[PDB]
Scaffold this active site. Structure first.
Site, PDB file in Angstrom:
ATOM      1  N   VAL A 196      -0.786   7.720  -1.125  1.00  0.00           N
ATOM      2  CA  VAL A 196      -1.416   7.264  -0.033  1.00  0.00           C
ATOM      3  C   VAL A 196      -2.484   7.954   0.253  1.00  0.00           C
ATOM      4  O   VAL A 196      -3.363   9.396  -0.538  1.00  0.00           O
ATOM      5  CB  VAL A 196      -0.395   8.862   0.817  1.00  0.00           C
ATOM      6  CG1 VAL A 196      -1.111   8.707   2.288  1.00  0.00           C
ATOM      7  CG2 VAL A 196       0.988   8.041   0.870  1.00  0.00           C
ATOM      8  N   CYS A 197      -3.734   7.620   0.946  1.00  0.00           N
ATOM      9  CA  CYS A 197      -5.704   7.526   0.883  1.00  0.00           C
ATOM     10  C   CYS A 197      -5.349   7.766   2.294  1.00  0.00           C
ATOM     11  O   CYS A 197      -5.533   6.515   3.546  1.00  0.00           O
ATOM     12  CB  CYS A 197      -6.273   6.118   0.653  1.00  0.00           C
ATOM     13  SG  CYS A 197      -5.713   5.957  -1.098  1.00  0.00           S
ATOM     14  N   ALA A 198      -5.293   9.098   2.983  1.00  0.00           N
ATOM     15  CA  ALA A 198      -5.658   8.946   3.972  1.00  0.00           C
ATOM     16  C   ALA A 198      -6.926   9.580   4.727  1.00  0.00           C
ATOM     17  O   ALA A 198      -8.148   9.288   3.322  1.00  0.00           O
ATOM     18  CB  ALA A 198      -5.895  10.806   4.678  1.00  0.00           C
TER      19      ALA A 198
END
Lengths: 167, 167
Positions: free
Chosen positions: B59-61
């Site tokens: 997951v890439c915020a």
């Protein structure tokens, strides 16, 4: 210390891989959910230690999963695919996909394992990674086969490992 | 030691993060091509150490890349995105690609860094990973801003870091 090769270039590996006849040293490594896994949790099983510089290389070599599959078709066998990759990166391994009794384990907080098992690369760009190696341990924790692979990018002697496992 | 939190549960972090006023200690970490990178290679620049438990979480915020871009839009600033992930895994990070002066660096054979910088998770399932932290080092190699983030899954005070880099 030992010498292996990478791109046919020489690589020092610490200490000495355990030899058949010897007692396997205890270890703790980390599973894909970040739990600690010890050699003693596999008491009475035959164990293959299948040790890689990385299992996160982006190529799925057919020979990897083939051996893992043949090994776990032998009764009372577990295969432990071990590397310095974090559990986050090992979680999508293909060599273990679809196969029971194949478990990935990381060394990231257990660097002493690589020293104890004579598979710690000591120099060059791959310093800190594991050498390519296969170690077979019997039901009573005695080593019955080991190989430190001479060229890190080439296959272990799977046929020889499988023969010991059956015999 | 220090205490932070991971999904609300307390986590021990070794030693003490350097405070504003501290002298930045030299370090060596490993780049994507397995080469060694030292603090001294950025002499004359301001350096932001952007320290993560992992940059391979799947997951890439959006807040991560945003900070990296805003920081490096400030003249004479480099951002070092640091974690225990191997260089193989750091390729899946969304926050450095295509941003000049944003570099990913691994601790996998330089565990002393996490000790020296007071960011080594000492207990719990995350033991051996870095805590979430930001450390801003100036051209004299003084620390001018630092934060050991209270909840490891939550954003640092990026606004404060950016302000110190402007002023």
């Amino acid at each position: 210390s030992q010498t292996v090769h990478f791109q046919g270039n020489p690589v020092t590996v610490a200490n000495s891989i355990p030899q058949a006849g010897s007692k396997a040293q205890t270890f703790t490594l980390v599973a894909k959910d970040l739990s600690d896994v010890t050699l003693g949790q596999f008491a009475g099983k035959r164990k293959v230690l299948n040790i890689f510089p990385s299992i996160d290389t982006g190529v799925c070599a057919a020979s990897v999963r083939k051996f893992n599959q043949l090994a776990t078709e032998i009764d009372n066998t577990v295969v432990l695919c071990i590397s310095a990759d974090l559990p986050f990166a090992q979680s999508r391994f293909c060599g273990a996909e679809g196969l029971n009794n194949v478990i990935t384990l990381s060394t990231f907080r257990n660097a002493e394992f690589l020293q104890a098992y004579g598979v710690a690369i000591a120099d060059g760009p791959l310093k800190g990674l594991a050498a390519r190696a296969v170690v077979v341990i019997d039901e009573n924790d005695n080593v019955i086969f080991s190989q430190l692979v001479d060229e890190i990018t080439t296959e272990p002697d799977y046929e020889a490992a499988l023969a010991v496992l059956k015999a």
